[PDB]
């Protein structure tokens, strides 16, 4: 079976030939029309058959038996749907490859800004092919944090605002997560991801020495997904502590 060099080589070429499906979808002058891509999912289903006949794909509808597959791809063809629909910007393609359950390749493609982030085990992380280094230490009071504030209880919201440097939000799990990997954000939180919302993220967190865990501090199952944090190492513990304090982060009423 194939080398990561050969797989990545073929993946990068495939992504670069989806500039032939979005311009058209950016149409939407009649969504929903976004649900149907999905074309993207199915076209990548074709790429696997053509190239990697034993590889399987986990994506939004439909899968089915998930453990234990040798060669597994997990995809969000469009992460940041509201952004694509409302903004035509700040959305991305997420792809991740797992071998015997080990993350081997990850991609986050910021198609609107022409930025491909890639993670390769054995080589490192890259953005348009220039090597990403471990971000510098970020304490919570020195960092910008990103989360959905409409979905947490007000007191937990207040406390995050007070303990952080600032708050921002891009609105695509994949992009808010790259801002963490890049040192731009100290942490990103998602209170209800699907496995494809965070699958690429594991290898970047590993290769760039980030913490990526559940909100209870535990290791995440890539096949199932969980309320999740990706964080700079110097502010991981403090964010979790704010989230879990005074009976937790969940919003009621």
């Amino acid at each position: 079976d194939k080398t990561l060099q050969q797989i990545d080589k073929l993946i990068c070429s495939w992504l670069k030939q989806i500039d032939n499906v979005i311009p058209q979808l950016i149409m939407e002058m009649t969504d929903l029309v976004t649900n149907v891509d999905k074309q993207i999912q199915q076209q990548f289903q074709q790429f696997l058959a053509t190239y990697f006949p034993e590889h399987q794909l986990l994506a939004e509808e439909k899968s089915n038996i998930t453990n234990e597959i040798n060669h597994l791809w997990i995809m969000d063809p469009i992460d940041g749907t509201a952004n694509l629909v409302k903004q035509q910007e700040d959305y991305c393609i997420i792809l991740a490859y797992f071998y015997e359950g080990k993350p081997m390749l990850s991609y986050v493609y910021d198609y609107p800004h022409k930025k491909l982030y890639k993670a390769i085990r054995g080589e490192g992380a890259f953005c348009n092919g220039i090597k990403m280094e471990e971000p510098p230490s970020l304490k919570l009071e020195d960092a910008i944090i990103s989360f959905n504030a409409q979905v947490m209880n007000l007191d937990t919201v207040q406390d995050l605002f007070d303990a952080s440097f600032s708050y921002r939000l891009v609105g695509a799990c994949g992009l808010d997560s790259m801002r963490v990997a890049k040192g731009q954000f100290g942490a990103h939180i998602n209170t209800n991801p699907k496995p494809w919302d965070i699958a690429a993220q594991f290898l970047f967190a590993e290769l760039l020495n980030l913490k990526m865990t559940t909100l209870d501090g535990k290791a995440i199952d890539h096949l199932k997904g969980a309320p999740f944090i990706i964080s700079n190492k110097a502010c991981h513990e403090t964010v979790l502590k704010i989230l879990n304090a005074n009976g937790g982060y969940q919003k009621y009423r």
Copy 2:
């Protein structure tokens, strides 16, 4: 002896050379000086200086109102530039992305040329009275009509009472924040956001938006719905025509929007 064409051309020339200056300034950035609450860096400081040198060479009779200047700026100035050398300074410092340069020219009080320069994303927005508004030379038309419940909004969730923040959460489609006023405003201009709110801007935070708001048929008012003096600055909204009073009605309701009351 200067047409708007000729002025735009030198400004465009000035903007273009700043990319041989900024990368080096980002590298030696930066480690509070002359600011009460605002952040400042070597980058803002040099860009301002460089633009003052521009006016000295091409437009010696024009005045500059900017983050570092305060000057005594009578409403009887014929040719005035209001500048934000870097808008989104926190963004610059922490992220090196989502900051912009803001320039606005006013002739006897009337906005004539406006520039919002998204340097990290090389998108230049400009508006020219008589020609229209442009994003990288591509013409901007009025954004499609957008109601609150269908629109994304942006604002600082940290400086309003949380009950106003909730109502606005409920009434809008979603919420995002870029974190530079000029950029969150340009989102409203191209129909990406329904509205953007700054509760306490300075003239340079909003100078360029007046002309974009006229030409793109946007609503740009105080949070009372009134005209804004381009020389003083008041709590402000820049909004799609269709969600403007809904945003203000929610903001002004239940005792208003201030955090401490």
